[PDB]
Amino acid sequence: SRSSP
Amino acid sequence: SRSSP
Amino acid sequence: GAMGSMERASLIQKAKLAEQAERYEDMAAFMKGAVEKGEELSCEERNLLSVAYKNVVGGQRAAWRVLSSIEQKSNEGSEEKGPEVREYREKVETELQGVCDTVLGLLDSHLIKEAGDAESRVFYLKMKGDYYRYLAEVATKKRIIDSARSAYQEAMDISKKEMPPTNPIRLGLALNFSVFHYEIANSPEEAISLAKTTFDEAMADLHTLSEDSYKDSTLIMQLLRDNLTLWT
Amino acid sequence: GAMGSMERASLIQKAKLAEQAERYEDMAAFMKGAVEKGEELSCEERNLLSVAYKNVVGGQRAAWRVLSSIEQKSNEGSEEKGPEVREYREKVETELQGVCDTVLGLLDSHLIKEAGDAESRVFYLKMKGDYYRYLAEVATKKRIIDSARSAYQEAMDISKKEMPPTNPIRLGLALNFSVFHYEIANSPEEAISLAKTTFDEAMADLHTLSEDSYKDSTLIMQLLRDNLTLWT
Ligand SMILES: [Cl-]
Ligand SMILES: [Cl-]
Ligand SMILES: [Cl-]
Ligand SMILES: [Cl-]
Ligand SMILES: [Mg+2]
Ligand SMILES: [Mg+2]
Ligand SMILES: [Mg+2]
Ligand SMILES: [Mg+2]
């Protein structure tokens, strides 16, 4: 899962 | 310039 | 601490140099020193603080995952190799927890309590949720999970009242809260619902934005979409 | 030091874990602890020592080059920005010099003097040349350059007497000495001649090698060729 930059 | 690994 | 003798402006300048040099531990130390001067942080300064610690903890998290995987493999017809894998995983874990505690300490003393504008308050509460989430990843825990949830929820409540649905802080908060639901709280349906609703409400507000704001918002919307594709 | 209480074998095991986790500072600290046990290092252990410190100093060198470039730009119609760029470049430089001094200290106490086989002695003398070369990159110097030259030359003399022209240690030594000539000693013709002769003598010996040794040697030969293409 990708989280925020 | 490349040096050794 | 060691930055007490350096001017606030010099600490900020050096944080920017450290970023250019990819020296994220230095960057984080400079930004900690700047926070400890006691003045509120501007938008750019908040972003420097976040970039620095995200990169530091990101390297620790990646290392912890490598070591944890090796440790789990050793605990399966696996030959006994002694305490070393556990010891070194614990060493990295303790350092990671220390960085999270440092960030949470800056937020509690006194960034959050002095943050009155929505942009700053949501930013810091999102950070609080994130660093409790990183603690939860290594915890073996219910109270840590509830602390992350509570911080994200307060940030969500403010963001929905005070910010447009395309605001990049609001979008990044929703993205990370959705990851919390999926990866930490065992709530994949809540994760999917939050990501979908967030994406759709932002879509409907894009028409209000300039070209540059459109680029900022759609970048984060794409991350929501990437997760939805992975999760469904 | 801090590793004095840990078993030699545990330090080696943890160095390998740190490598897998890309925790090169930890890896270097574990390998320093292993060296300080006072026993000679095996071939695999020498390679762990080299990998660890090469990665640590490599990050410092890259950071130093970024900061030095910014500093040189500031010293051109450039607006005065105060002492901060110089100060932070100096901070990184001092840390880099400290790592080089640590490595040179391990070599002098007592890795080199106990190394009698050609493979170990050449390896350590090459390392001595390399870390003096890194000191020379930031020095503002003649004695440091001569120390690098002297170490490389002793390593070259042993390698030519005791090792075949395809030996990967001999090849990597010649590669790095050629870089010294080009980048440090203002001797591009010597660099080119050394790289050419080294490449050609290895070419003529490839027929003696197994498939796996051929792969090892040709990998380093390609680096010699890459430099010759850049330099001519
Ligand atoms: Cl450990
Ligand atoms: Cl609300
Ligand atoms: Cl500094
Ligand atoms: Cl010789
Ligand atoms: Mg002041
Ligand atoms: Mg305020
Ligand atoms: Mg023992
Ligand atoms: Mg010996």
Side-chain angles (χ1 to χ4, degrees), chain C residues 53-126:
Chain C
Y53 280 107
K54 279 300 177 66
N55 278 89
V56 172
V57 80
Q60 296 173 316
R61 291 164 73 207
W64 185 94
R65 290 173 188 168
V66 167
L67 298 170
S68 182
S69 178
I70 295 168
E71 187 180 13
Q72 296 313 317
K73 271 278 144 178
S74 77
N75 297 331
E76 293 181 344
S78 297
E79 197 61 47
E80 172 63 33
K81 255 52 184 161
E84 290 85 358
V85 169
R86 174 187 53 78
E87 288 170 351
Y88 185 49
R89 188 269 300 156
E90 284 173 350
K91 177 191 172 74
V92 173
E93 183 172 302
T94 299
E95 292 179 15
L96 185 160
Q97 292 168 323
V99 171
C100 294
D101 290 345
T102 292
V103 173
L104 293 169
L106 294 174
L107 296 169
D108 200 48
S109 302
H110 299 279
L111 290 169
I112 289 170
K113 66 173 61 60
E114 294 297 351
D117 292 356
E119 290 65 36
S120 62
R121 192 162 188 84
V122 172
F123 189 97
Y124 293 135
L125 287 166
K126 173 184 170 298

Side-chain angles (χ1 to χ4, degrees), chain C residues 178 187-200 228 231:
Chain C
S178 75
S187 300
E189 291 175 333
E190 186 71 14
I192 291 162
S193 186
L194 178 55
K196 281 176 171 179
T197 288
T198 301
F199 183 97
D200 292 339
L228 285 165
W231 295 344

Side-chain angles (χ1 to χ4, degrees), chain C residues 10 14 23 26 84 87-88, chain D residues 10 14 26 84 87-88:
Chain C
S10 298
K14 292 180 183 179
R23 292 273 293 198
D26 287 349
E84 290 85 358
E87 288 170 351
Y88 185 49
Chain D
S10 298
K14 292 180 183 179
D26 287 349
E84 290 85 358
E87 288 170 351
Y88 185 49

